[PDB]
Amino acid sequence: LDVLNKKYSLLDHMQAMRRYLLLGQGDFIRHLMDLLKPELVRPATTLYQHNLTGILETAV
Amino acid sequence: FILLKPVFHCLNEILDLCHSFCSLVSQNLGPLDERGAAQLSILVKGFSRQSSLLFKILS
Amino acid sequence: LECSWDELWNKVQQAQDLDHIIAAHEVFLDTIISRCLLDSDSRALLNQLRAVFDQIIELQN
Amino acid sequence: REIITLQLGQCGNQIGFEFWKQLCAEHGISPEGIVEEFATDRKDVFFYQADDEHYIPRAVLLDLEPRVIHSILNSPYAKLYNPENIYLGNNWASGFSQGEKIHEDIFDIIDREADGSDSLEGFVLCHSIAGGTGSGLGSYLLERLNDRYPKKLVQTYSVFPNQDEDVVVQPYNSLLTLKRLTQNADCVVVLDNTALNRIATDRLHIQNPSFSQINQLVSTIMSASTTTLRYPGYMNNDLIGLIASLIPTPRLHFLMTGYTPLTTDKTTVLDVMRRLLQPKNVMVSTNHCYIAILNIIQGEVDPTQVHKSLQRIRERKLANFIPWGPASIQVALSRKSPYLPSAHRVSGLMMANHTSISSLFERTCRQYDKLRKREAFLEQFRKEDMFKDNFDEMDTSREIVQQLIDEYHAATRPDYISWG
Amino acid sequence: REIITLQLGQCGNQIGFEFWKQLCAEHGISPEGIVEEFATDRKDVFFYQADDEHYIPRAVLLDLEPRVIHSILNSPYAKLYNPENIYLGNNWASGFSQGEKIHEDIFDIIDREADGSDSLEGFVLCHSIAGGTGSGLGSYLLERLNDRYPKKLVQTYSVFPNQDEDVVVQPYNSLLTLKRLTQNADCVVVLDNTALNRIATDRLHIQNPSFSQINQLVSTIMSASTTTLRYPGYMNNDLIGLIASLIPTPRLHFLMTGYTPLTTDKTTVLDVMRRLLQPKNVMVSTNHCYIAILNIIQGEVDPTQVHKSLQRIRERKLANFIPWGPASIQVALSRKSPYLPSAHRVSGLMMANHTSISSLFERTCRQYDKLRKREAFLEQFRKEDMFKDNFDEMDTSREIVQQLIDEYHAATRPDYISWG
Amino acid sequence: AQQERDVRELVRGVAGLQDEADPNFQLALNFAWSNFRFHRFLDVNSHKIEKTIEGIYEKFVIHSDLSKAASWKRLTEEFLNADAHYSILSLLLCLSDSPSNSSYVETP
């Protein structure tokens, strides 16, 4: 237990599976979706990861 | 991007098109018709096509 | 995410075995499926809830 | 996101400076702006993101003939913010005309701070109703912001004036300012000086430094209202998501406030729920039922017993409510704020849309109508006379507040399915 | 390769002498030319490869009626260079005629230095727009070099004149000199004395020794522009590779300059990128979008975070840009220069092709048109009258700068796929 | 032989042109044959088709459409047992399933 929770940080993963995947960090999501409006209003036939990857960064 | 990828072959193709482009426009001179239009058409169509392909390798 | 987070938070922070942590995370993740409408029984209820999200975006137009 | 705070008038500059001292002591902030060795939390709501985290408050001070601004000056918290946004009678007409003549350079101060900001989301006006220099000037300038920026939110912190009427034009000043609060503002929080003085004489035997104590009270109010933003919470991290639940009608934006610990010199959440449901924990003084009630709590809670608390308070049916429509009491929870002394660990604060405020409006209506029929309490200001020869702006405001009283009373009726 | 530097006029000789003092202090150079005990780097751009490394600057000084040249004389840096390339009114006509009468021997000085050089790559003219003795003489002589050497590059360092109009023929002088800058020069860097004085009053409270301070500023500019050459860098070790990215149109060769530290009395590359993207770090004063922006940086950087910086500045979309065409912001990096005191370790410099300069051109156009319609501000020079009886050279320059303004505004349009 | 009749029947069916003596029929038929003869595509990668089918199954399970996921897997597994398979699959596809998770009304 002692090595798994510090050298590979088993707890912080559960913490960041909660903040993001369970959407527990709500501060991130509102500015994310605020910046994400022009992308999502375009149909994703014309969306790619290169449009996505760093509006991620402005949000972060 | 020297490791053998599809990407690397595309980059080599761009370089060879650039070399053939340089050879024509260098010897051309100041603007003059020297039967240049056919070679020009092949060259500009090649640049447009391959640059369009390079927007498909951006993801 | 608050009563649930409490249950998971106890069953890891005391747990003196890896296998107890594993099965603490397990039942927690499965329980959130039953609290929401993503269960096998509640698919119809989820359809009802989808039908009330249609009018919200409709009201925008 | 980024909200720019406005402080004006003697009273508004007082509670604004006190609240900035509150947030400097609250977060890990030096009196110079320097991030301290105990500072994490969300620090960009009013805090300028400087390099060494000089969290400079977005605080714009604009008045004329400075008196209390000198008292703000001799302080180390004049080094907390100064991006040069600090700027150097007691009637509505005089303040209106004085705001008219210098509107351009102070609006340039507004614009400079606006483009200097990353974004703009709200105007928070530190004010008091008929606050002397604040009145007239604030209504005028509020019209300038609402005309100039129609895409932003207005919250006006003010108190109901009770000075035991001496200025006799005060119902006129409050009536015109209240007109501007109806048509140029989207949220107005008013509090009774009477009921606050009653609570002050209730908990202790001090009523004489009333200015200093009321600064503590409304600074606790405003820090508690913004605590979910300034410390990482989950919801109402926008102002607009908080405002939307309270308002079914964009002219009914006047809210009642209450605070659950009346002494500060803990227990479960059902208990504070029952406490806040009593009208003696309320800071504000026929049948009146609330439209929608929402509460913020900060303290040491049981995360399952809040469900049980709403369950028992519901099945108690300890309240009435309004005929027209499904609303609820609404719970909201955040952290108990660190880095301050934490006494009486549960502190709750309530925002409710109540029809009882229409009686308070009618009191001011009756006062204005009485002084209007007597017509010896305007003192014939020449600025008021050239501003309005017939004084029908006061007639139009009285029409507006009467329409609001009609909306209040028809909202008391189940016929607010029909028009109010 | 080998570039010969030209200094002329009072202003141009000032910043040229200051810049040669800058490069003498910068590299391991004595005031006599002797290589010092701390000198490696590329030292053949302006430096004569002598045997004992007497790195003699390729500095040709040509004027008439010497005043400031005497101040250059009483100095040990008159022993740095003298291959006998130093040569002994304030109007365009007077300077034009004076350059006409002695064009042959000073062009022999040019030719002697040219064959004495190993190669020739550029003419760097140290100048100011309407620089008194520099104006007229410089436009004439620039025509002589462009006719005589059409295979070389012309960069003209000059400043926009602001002397608060006194010479009244100054818009005529600048208009004719600007014509010669359009048709006989391939790059013109102009700077506003107004904005530089604003930055000087901004960082400090000194504006009175403006000549001395502006010498420091443009000497930092020119050393930073040539640092990638004079110290071993990777690219833009030719002038032409630097010039090619900026220019899509050989008449639009007028560039805006900015400098990221405004105080000198460090941090990451994303930060200076955001700083330089602000227009208050710019040394120069409708809708205007840049054609192409390129930046040089010198300092202590993280070599991976420059990728991250371009990534975040791109996805911020903190700029606009031009409709017609794929350009970019362009990063360029070199060493922080040794052997000088290194304060505020990151110093960045930007070259951008912006359409905002067309307004500045239109200001001078309106001034010239006003004085032309009045027609009392040419003072009837006999040299101007015999040079041009109808003064249609000024009409032709006004046509040229109007065509450039049209190219600027159609380049603002997406229809620069069609003609501008 | 049957090819030509099939291309005619396709024009009739999809384009809604049931009269061969309409000139628009012959224009659509000429367009269809000239499109078939303009070889401009790579041949079908069976592995890419399999990856897409599996991903469609994943999208169904991610959306908790269990009946649609089980039917998708079952039908694709049965059809792929006795080249032209992957052809017809890509052909139908071009994107994915329409009516995103609301077409699981299997009668039998």
Side-chain angles (χ1 to χ4, degrees), chain F residues 79-96 99:
Chain F
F79 169 63
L80 282 164
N81 308 329
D83 303 334
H85 310 268
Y86 312 94
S87 157
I88 299 158
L89 303 168
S90 44
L91 170 63
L92 301 155
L93 269 154
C94 177
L95 56 101
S96 41

Short mmCIF file of all heavy atoms in Angstrom, two decimals, chain F residues 79-107, unseen atoms left out:
data_model
loop_
_atom_site.label_atom_id
_atom_site.label_comp_id
_atom_site.label_asym_id
_atom_site.label_seq_id
_atom_site.Cartn_x
_atom_site.Cartn_y
_atom_site.Cartn_z
N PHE F 79 -23.12 -11.96 -39.88
CA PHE F 79 -22.99 -11.61 -41.30
C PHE F 79 -21.59 -11.88 -41.81
O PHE F 79 -21.41 -12.24 -42.98
CB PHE F 79 -23.38 -10.15 -41.52
CG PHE F 79 -23.02 -9.64 -42.90
CD1 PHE F 79 -23.60 -10.19 -44.03
CD2 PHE F 79 -22.08 -8.62 -43.05
CE1 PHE F 79 -23.26 -9.72 -45.30
CE2 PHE F 79 -21.75 -8.15 -44.31
CZ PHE F 79 -22.33 -8.70 -45.44
N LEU F 80 -20.58 -11.75 -40.95
CA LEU F 80 -19.19 -11.88 -41.38
C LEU F 80 -18.73 -13.33 -41.51
O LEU F 80 -17.53 -13.59 -41.61
CB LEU F 80 -18.28 -11.12 -40.41
CG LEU F 80 -18.27 -9.61 -40.61
CD1 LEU F 80 -17.68 -8.90 -39.40
CD2 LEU F 80 -17.50 -9.24 -41.87
N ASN F 81 -19.67 -14.28 -41.51
CA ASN F 81 -19.38 -15.70 -41.72
C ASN F 81 -20.20 -16.16 -42.92
O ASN F 81 -21.37 -16.51 -42.76
CB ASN F 81 -19.71 -16.52 -40.48
CG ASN F 81 -19.07 -15.97 -39.22
OD1 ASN F 81 -17.99 -15.37 -39.27
ND2 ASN F 81 -19.72 -16.16 -38.09
N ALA F 82 -19.57 -16.14 -44.10
CA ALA F 82 -20.11 -16.66 -45.36
C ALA F 82 -21.46 -16.05 -45.75
O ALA F 82 -21.86 -16.10 -46.91
CB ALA F 82 -20.22 -18.18 -45.31
N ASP F 83 -14.91 -10.06 -47.71
CA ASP F 83 -14.46 -9.09 -48.71
C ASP F 83 -15.62 -8.22 -49.15
O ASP F 83 -15.62 -7.01 -48.92
CB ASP F 83 -13.84 -9.80 -49.91
CG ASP F 83 -12.69 -10.69 -49.52
OD1 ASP F 83 -12.05 -10.41 -48.48
OD2 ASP F 83 -12.43 -11.67 -50.24
N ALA F 84 -16.60 -8.85 -49.80
CA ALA F 84 -17.82 -8.15 -50.18
C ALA F 84 -18.61 -7.72 -48.95
O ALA F 84 -19.36 -6.74 -49.01
CB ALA F 84 -18.68 -9.05 -51.08
N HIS F 85 -18.44 -8.45 -47.84
CA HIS F 85 -18.92 -8.07 -46.52
C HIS F 85 -18.51 -6.65 -46.16
O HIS F 85 -19.36 -5.76 -46.12
CB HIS F 85 -18.38 -9.04 -45.46
CG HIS F 85 -18.57 -10.49 -45.78
ND1 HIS F 85 -19.67 -11.21 -45.37
CD2 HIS F 85 -17.78 -11.37 -46.46
CE1 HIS F 85 -19.56 -12.46 -45.78
NE2 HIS F 85 -18.42 -12.58 -46.45
N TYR F 86 -17.19 -6.45 -46.01
CA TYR F 86 -16.61 -5.16 -45.63
C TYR F 86 -16.96 -4.06 -46.61
O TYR F 86 -17.13 -2.89 -46.22
CB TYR F 86 -15.09 -5.31 -45.54
CG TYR F 86 -14.63 -6.51 -44.75
CD1 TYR F 86 -14.33 -7.71 -45.38
CD2 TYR F 86 -14.49 -6.44 -43.37
CE1 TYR F 86 -13.93 -8.82 -44.66
CE2 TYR F 86 -14.08 -7.53 -42.64
CZ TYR F 86 -13.80 -8.72 -43.29
OH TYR F 86 -13.38 -9.81 -42.56
N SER F 87 -17.08 -4.42 -47.89
CA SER F 87 -17.57 -3.53 -48.94
C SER F 87 -18.94 -2.98 -48.58
O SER F 87 -19.06 -1.76 -48.37
CB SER F 87 -17.63 -4.27 -50.28
OG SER F 87 -18.56 -3.66 -51.16
N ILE F 88 -19.92 -3.88 -48.42
CA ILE F 88 -21.29 -3.48 -48.10
C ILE F 88 -21.35 -2.69 -46.80
O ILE F 88 -22.08 -1.71 -46.69
CB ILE F 88 -22.22 -4.71 -48.05
CG1 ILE F 88 -22.25 -5.43 -49.39
CG2 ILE F 88 -23.64 -4.33 -47.71
CD1 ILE F 88 -22.68 -6.88 -49.28
N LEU F 89 -20.50 -3.06 -45.83
CA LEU F 89 -20.48 -2.35 -44.55
C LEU F 89 -20.05 -0.89 -44.70
O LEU F 89 -20.75 0.02 -44.24
CB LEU F 89 -19.56 -3.07 -43.55
CG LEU F 89 -19.88 -4.53 -43.27
CD1 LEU F 89 -18.76 -5.20 -42.51
CD2 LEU F 89 -21.20 -4.69 -42.54
N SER F 90 -18.91 -0.66 -45.38
CA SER F 90 -18.41 0.71 -45.59
C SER F 90 -19.38 1.55 -46.40
O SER F 90 -19.62 2.74 -46.10
CB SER F 90 -17.07 0.64 -46.31
OG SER F 90 -17.13 -0.31 -47.37
N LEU F 91 -19.89 0.94 -47.47
CA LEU F 91 -20.96 1.41 -48.34
C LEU F 91 -22.16 1.97 -47.60
O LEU F 91 -22.58 3.11 -47.85
CB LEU F 91 -21.41 0.24 -49.20
CG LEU F 91 -22.65 0.31 -50.05
CD1 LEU F 91 -22.51 1.38 -51.10
CD2 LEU F 91 -22.76 -1.02 -50.68
N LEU F 92 -22.73 1.15 -46.71
CA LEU F 92 -23.83 1.60 -45.86
C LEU F 92 -23.37 2.72 -44.94
O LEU F 92 -24.12 3.68 -44.70
CB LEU F 92 -24.36 0.45 -45.01
CG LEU F 92 -24.94 -0.83 -45.59
CD1 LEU F 92 -24.78 -1.92 -44.54
CD2 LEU F 92 -26.39 -0.65 -45.98
N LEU F 93 -22.16 2.59 -44.39
CA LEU F 93 -21.73 3.49 -43.34
C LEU F 93 -21.56 4.94 -43.74
O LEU F 93 -22.42 5.78 -43.46
CB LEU F 93 -20.36 3.03 -42.83
CG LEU F 93 -20.13 2.07 -41.68
CD1 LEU F 93 -18.78 1.40 -41.90
CD2 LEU F 93 -20.14 2.83 -40.37
N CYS F 94 -20.40 5.22 -44.34
CA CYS F 94 -19.80 6.57 -44.48
C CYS F 94 -19.64 7.40 -43.19
O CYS F 94 -18.66 8.12 -43.04
CB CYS F 94 -20.61 7.42 -45.46
SG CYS F 94 -20.06 9.14 -45.71
N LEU F 95 -20.53 7.24 -42.20
CA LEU F 95 -20.34 7.85 -40.90
C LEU F 95 -20.47 6.77 -39.84
O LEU F 95 -19.44 6.27 -39.34
CB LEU F 95 -21.33 9.03 -40.78
CG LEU F 95 -22.87 8.93 -40.95
CD1 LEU F 95 -23.71 8.90 -39.67
CD2 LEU F 95 -23.44 9.99 -41.86
N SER F 96 -21.68 6.28 -39.55
CA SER F 96 -22.06 5.48 -38.41
C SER F 96 -23.56 5.22 -38.48
O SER F 96 -24.18 5.39 -39.54
CB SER F 96 -21.71 6.14 -37.08
OG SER F 96 -22.00 7.52 -37.12
N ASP F 97 -24.14 4.82 -37.35
CA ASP F 97 -25.59 4.72 -37.19
C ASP F 97 -26.26 6.09 -37.08
O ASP F 97 -25.78 6.98 -36.39
CB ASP F 97 -25.92 3.90 -35.94
N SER F 98 -27.37 6.24 -37.80
CA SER F 98 -28.28 7.35 -37.61
C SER F 98 -29.27 7.02 -36.50
O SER F 98 -29.33 5.88 -36.01
CB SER F 98 -29.02 7.67 -38.91
N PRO F 99 -30.06 8.04 -36.11
CA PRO F 99 -31.05 7.97 -35.02
C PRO F 99 -30.43 7.46 -33.73
O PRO F 99 -30.93 6.50 -33.14
CB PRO F 99 -32.27 7.12 -35.41
N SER F 100 -29.41 8.19 -33.27
CA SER F 100 -28.19 7.70 -32.61
C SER F 100 -28.33 6.45 -31.75
O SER F 100 -27.71 5.42 -32.04
CB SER F 100 -27.60 8.82 -31.75
N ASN F 101 -29.16 6.51 -30.71
CA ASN F 101 -29.36 5.35 -29.86
C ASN F 101 -30.85 5.04 -29.73
O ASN F 101 -31.32 4.68 -28.65
CB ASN F 101 -28.75 5.58 -28.48
N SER F 102 -31.59 5.18 -30.83
CA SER F 102 -33.05 5.10 -30.77
C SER F 102 -33.59 4.30 -31.94
O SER F 102 -34.61 4.66 -32.55
CB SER F 102 -33.67 6.49 -30.74
N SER F 103 -32.94 3.19 -32.28
CA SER F 103 -33.40 2.34 -33.37
C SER F 103 -33.29 0.87 -32.99
O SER F 103 -32.94 0.02 -33.82
CB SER F 103 -32.64 2.62 -34.66
N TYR F 104 -33.58 0.54 -31.73
CA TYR F 104 -33.43 -0.81 -31.20
C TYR F 104 -34.78 -1.51 -31.03
O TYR F 104 -34.99 -2.26 -30.07
CB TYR F 104 -32.67 -0.79 -29.88
N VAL F 105 -35.71 -1.28 -31.95
CA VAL F 105 -37.04 -1.88 -31.88
C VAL F 105 -37.10 -3.14 -32.75
O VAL F 105 -37.83 -3.22 -33.74
CB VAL F 105 -38.10 -0.87 -32.29
N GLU F 106 -36.32 -4.14 -32.35
CA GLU F 106 -36.31 -5.42 -33.07
C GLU F 106 -37.56 -6.21 -32.73
O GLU F 106 -37.81 -6.52 -31.56
CB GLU F 106 -35.06 -6.21 -32.71
N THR F 107 -38.36 -6.52 -33.76
CA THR F 107 -39.60 -7.26 -33.55
C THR F 107 -39.32 -8.70 -33.16
O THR F 107 -39.74 -9.16 -32.09
CB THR F 107 -40.47 -7.19 -34.81
#
